[PDB]
Symmetry: D2
Subunit: 199 residues, 4 copies
Amino acid sequence: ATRSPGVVISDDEPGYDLDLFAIPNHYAEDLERVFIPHGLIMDRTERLARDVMKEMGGHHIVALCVLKGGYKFFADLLDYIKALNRNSDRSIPMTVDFIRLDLSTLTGKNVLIVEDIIDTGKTMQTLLSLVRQYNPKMVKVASLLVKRTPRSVGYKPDFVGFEIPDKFVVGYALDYNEYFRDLNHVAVISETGKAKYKA
Amino acid sequence: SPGVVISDDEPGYDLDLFAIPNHYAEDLERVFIPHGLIMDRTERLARDVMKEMGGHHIVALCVLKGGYKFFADLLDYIKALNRNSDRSIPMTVDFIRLLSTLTGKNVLIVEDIIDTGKTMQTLLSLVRQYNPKMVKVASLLVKRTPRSVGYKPDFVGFEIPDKFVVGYALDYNEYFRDLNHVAVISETGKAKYKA
Amino acid sequence: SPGVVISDDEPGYDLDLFAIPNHYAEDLERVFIPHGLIMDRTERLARDVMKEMGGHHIVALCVLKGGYKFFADLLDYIKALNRNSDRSIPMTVDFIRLKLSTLTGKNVLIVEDIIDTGKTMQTLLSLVRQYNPKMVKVASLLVKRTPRSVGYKPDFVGFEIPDKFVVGYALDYNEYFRDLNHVAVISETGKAKYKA
Amino acid sequence: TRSPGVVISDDEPGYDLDLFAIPNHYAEDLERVFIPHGLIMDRTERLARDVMKEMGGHHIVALCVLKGGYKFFADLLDYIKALNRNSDRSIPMTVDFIRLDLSTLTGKNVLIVEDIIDTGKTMQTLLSLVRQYNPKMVKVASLLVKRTPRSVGYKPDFVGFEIPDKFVVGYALDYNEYFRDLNHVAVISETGKAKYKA
Ligand SMILES: Nc1nc2c(ncn2C[C@@H](COCP(=O)(O)O)OC[C@@H](O)P(=O)(O)O)c(=O)[nH]1
Ligand SMILES: Nc1nc2c(ncn2C[C@@H](COCP(=O)(O)O)OC[C@@H](O)P(=O)(O)O)c(=O)[nH]1
Ligand SMILES: Nc1nc2c(ncn2C[C@@H](COCP(=O)(O)O)OC[C@@H](O)P(=O)(O)O)c(=O)[nH]1
Ligand SMILES: Nc1nc2c(ncn2C[C@@H](COCP(=O)(O)O)OC[C@@H](O)P(=O)(O)O)c(=O)[nH]1
């Protein structure tokens, strides 16, 4: 719930062609276009980590990961946060948990909920109400990707990595029928790939 | 077979030989395994896993909560092998709170440290009862301790002396998370960060 | 292909979207290519290089000076491909000064960090060709769309950028901005701040 | 100039080959891995801050000696540039290459970067040639110092690893331009010496 919408990727002109970057060859016909390369994600994630310690560094941080199979972004975000802490000459305690949808550990602490993708946003909103119930000092939501979808409730994430168009993306932290885990770029899935690896 | 064996006669490296956080200067006695050495070993471990379990679909279970870090890096190296194999390979990723889906599947249990070995032996008995095709355990650290039952993981990163270590994936009252290397905690550190 | 094309519509990113050293906050105007984007593109360039001339032994020549980071990273990806090729592939690595008989009959890769007008490379190619090499191709990280270009185009291009003076990654300004890992447009303030 | 760096003892040196990831085409060409790639990186990171605390106050001249190697110089520079990001001032730095315009060294902090020091004759030859251009401060960094009686008694200001007297390859150390894709420092085998002979 802040002004920064993050790195915007418009419907006019999105992403780069597949030939310009290194894609696993078994995914050659399963993707349409690359929206966000792995390294671009890392750079943005590094800035997000500095945004988090800027607004939440005041109290003991509880980093809360959602278990959607996507551990990748949560692990990367935390790595950058730890990188900041090791050069702060104060030893900074931090606890990390996981939620699948005892939380008494959240009382009076800065809670950071980390999400990979936000589409409808009611999965996210549902989690705020449960965490706020345990009376934390503050709750912030980090999201790597926010899709511009008509299924928008109106809820706005605090820390956003990228704002992407309404396409079904896979890669990096997002999978499809447990496929595309070895793909480190965020790319749009094709009709071929959507049918080939269908459940 | 027992992994990289860190003997008892001299225990890793001096603190000033590597870059440790300044606020952990007095809280450590010695560095056993530098971060880079862990990563290079884990890359080989990932190759060993694909060797004995790459036959069928792999369900990788992370034991919560001793440390997520080793699990994250182990799977990163596994995916690296998968994307260069000219073959679309699916993989299940799950976490254990300490589940009947595990029936007839190739299950990989990932632990960051094994001390006595009783936690893992207990976890194994619970998993086998759901009749999995194969269950193997990967452990980053196995300690040489007289308090051990006799359990040995299928995959071992390092065999270390009987000393309380922190860093990389092992914390102490939610401290030392920002420490990359595996180091022995000092008596100062134990008392400074007690609960 | 001309590589990744950065148009002049409204390119780059706001400085607030990425991590930038605080002592460079006022000295930069906009970030064109983040460090990670350079690396992902460079990895692909390494693949392209190890296909048009990466058959056997190559001689990789880095132009001095102007940069070194791009040459180091490009070779790191090349060496990463070689160690998965199931074949021991030797490689010559050396640097060239622009004011050498080894190049005779060799497969030469000239690595450059940026190409503006292109006369430096045209001049460089004409001299190398006189030593009669088996083949000489040029890889460049950046190629600027400038009205000043003679018309030279490299065999391999990383990014095509607007006619703006950029610093970072492998490009400096009076030996400053070396610690800046993103490619960014230097501001008027910084340009005057770090003058020679 | 008396911290010998990470000492690798000689009764049992390094690690077995099967414990780490080694390129398949080098499987028979090596005997023993001394220093894994990641261990080099961690040590190099520490070296980078040793350098910056002594010399790195202001403007330094990073001088690389060309052996066909460059990897260590590039990695050491990367860690140094990583430190200067968290400094609260902009640090200028010049990087150059020399094989044995040197008026540019006068009155500046000169850092000579070496990958391997064996007898040490190369370094003291180079030192005597640099110190006569009157630099404000000239010091030597070396990734590897071999422990050999053939040494002329020269010791570098900054040392990464002190290794036994064996012929090592990998990471910034080639053998007839081979082993460049090997990221670990390993001992070359007899099969390797003949397989990649000139
Ligand atoms: N790979 C991929 N997955 C996506 C995409 N968009 C949504 N998802 C999954 C969704 C939860 O999954 C619903 P299900 O399949 O489990 O029923 O995530 C958003 C929810 O958290 P929201 O905020 O409530 O909308 C996408 O573009 N690519
Ligand atoms: N950081 C750190 N932690 C250690 C160390 N040795 C043991 N632990 C914790 C122990 C579980 O701790 C129970 P708790 O008291 O924390 O609740 O893990 C081993 C069991 O899984 P085991 O195999 O059954 O013995 C150590 O050297 N360093
Ligand atoms: N950092 C930075 N440097 C730039 C830029 N554009 C040009 N240069 C330098 C120029 C050579 O330097 C001339 P000097 O400084 O020695 O006088 O490189 C182009 C020649 O190779 P070209 O192809 O012949 O035009 C730029 O945008 N950023
Ligand atoms: N790969 C590899 N190379 C080594 C090793 N030990 C020495 N070298 C080369 C030597 C110069 O090479 C002489 P050449 O054969 O090229 O003529 O470097 C040391 C001189 O700088 P020093 O200090 O004066 O003795 C080693 O263990 N492995």
